[PDB]
């Protein structure tokens, strides 16, 4: 797939800096192309030195075996900030169980009645109008010239 070859064309003198520098990426497992050539100018042809200028601390060998050089083969990212954590709203009530409304239906009527009534009820009006007619003599005995 990624054959480390193809077709070489001269460039022998350059083959030196290539290998030496290439190495720097191998021993210390460094991945900086700029800091490397820099480690060379200071090493003056010294490997463990150019290496030292890069790690200048510790260093092993089985760390990261030159596997690739593109998408860092990133075999995983990591948990970011955190979850969303939405609102846990789910209480209240859509209906609110309000059956007292009808209690208003009848109630309201209880009004149209206590307002349509006449406090009386016995309807003594009949006995009245009557006693009146007679007052003037309701009917008539000896009709007039009319």
Curated annotation (Swiss-Prot):
Highest taxon in the source lineage: Eukaryota
Annotated localization: Cytoplasm
Crosslink site: Glycyl lysine isopeptide (Lys-Gly) (interchain with G-Cter in SUMO): 99
Protein name, UniProt field: Ubiquitin carboxyl-terminal hydrolase 25
Stretches for region SUMO interaction domain (SIM): 77-102
Family (UniProt): Belongs to the peptidase C19 family.
Role played: Deubiquitinating enzyme that hydrolyzes ubiquitin moieties conjugated to substrates and thus, functions in various biological processes including inflammation and immune response. Modulates the Wnt/beta-catenin pathway by deubiquitinating and stabilizing tankyrases TNKS1 and TNKS2. Regulates KEAP1-NRF2 axis in the defense against oxidative assaults by deubiquitinating KEAP1 and protecting it from degradation leading to degradation of the NRF2 transcription factor that is responsible for mounting an anti-oxidation gene expression program. The muscle-specific isoform (USP25m) may have a role in the regulation of muscular differentiation and function.
Domain UBA-like: 14-57
Tissue: Isoform USP25a is found in most adult and fetal tissues; expression is moderately high in testis, pancreas, kidney, skeletal muscle, liver, lung, placenta, heart, but very low in peripheral blood, colon, small intestine, ovary, prostate, thymus and spleen. Expressed in the brain, with high levels in the cerebral cortex. Isoform USP25b is found in all tissues except heart and skeletal muscle. Isoform USP25m is heart and skeletal muscle specific.
Stretches assigned to the UIM domain: 97-116, 123-140
Subunit structure of this chain's protein: Homotetramer, inhibited form. Homodimer, active form. Interacts with ACTA1 (via its C-terminus); the interaction occurs for all isoforms but is strongest for isoform USP25m in muscle differentiating cells. Interacts (isoform USP25m only) with MYBPC1; the interaction prevents proteasomal degradation of MYBPC1. Interacts (isoform USP25m only) with FLNC (via filament repeats 17-18, 20-21 and 24). Interacts with GAPDH. Interacts with SUMO3; the interaction sumoylates efficiently USP25. Interacts with SUMO2; the interaction sumoylates efficiently USP25.
Taxonomic placement: Eukaryota, Metazoa, Chordata, Craniata, Vertebrata
Phenotype upon changing residue 91 to A: No interaction with SUMO3
Associated disorder: Epilepsy, idiopathic generalized 19: An autosomal dominant form of idiopathic generalized epilepsy, a disorder characterized by recurring generalized seizures in the absence of detectable brain lesions and/or metabolic abnormalities. Generalized seizures arise diffusely and simultaneously from both hemispheres of the brain. Seizure types include juvenile myoclonic seizures, absence seizures, and generalized tonic-clonic seizures. EIG19 is characterized by onset of variable types of seizures in the first two decades of life.
Induction annotation: The muscle-specific isoform (USP25m) is up-regulated during myocyte differentiation. Levels increase up to 100-fold towards completion of differentiation.
Effect caused by changing residue 99 to R: Abolishes sumoylation. Decreased enzymatic activity
Cross-link (Glycyl lysine isopeptide (Lys-Gly) (interchain with G-Cter in ubiquitin)): 99
Processing after translation: Acetylated. Sumoylation impairs binding to and hydrolysis of ubiquitin chains. Sumoylated preferentially with SUMO2 or SUMO3. Desumoylated by SENP1. Polyubiquitinated by SMURF1 by promoting the 'Lys-48'-linkage leading to proteasomal degradation.
Extent of motif Required for SUMO paralog-specific binding: 89-95
Modified residues annotated as Phosphoserine in this record: 85
């Amino acid at each position: 797939m990624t054959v480390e070859q193809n077709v070489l064309q001269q460039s022998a003198a350059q083959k030196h800096q290539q290998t030496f520098l290439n190495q720097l990426r191998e021993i210390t497992g460094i991945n900086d192309t700029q800091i490397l050539q820099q480690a060379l100018k200071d090493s003056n042809g010294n490997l463990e030195l150019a290496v030292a200028f890069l790690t200048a601390k510790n260093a092993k060998t089985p760390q990261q075996e030159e596997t690739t050089y593109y998408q860092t083969a990133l075999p995983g990212n990591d948990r970011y900030i955190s979850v969303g954590s939405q609102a846990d709203t789910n209480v209240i009530d859509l209906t609110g169980d309000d059956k007292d409304d009808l209690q208003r239906a009848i109630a309201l009527s209880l009004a149209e009645s206590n307002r349509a009534f006449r406090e009386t009820g016995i309807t003594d009006e009949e006995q009245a109008i009557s006693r009146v007619l007679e007052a003037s003599i309701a009917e008539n005995k000896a009709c007039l010239k009319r």
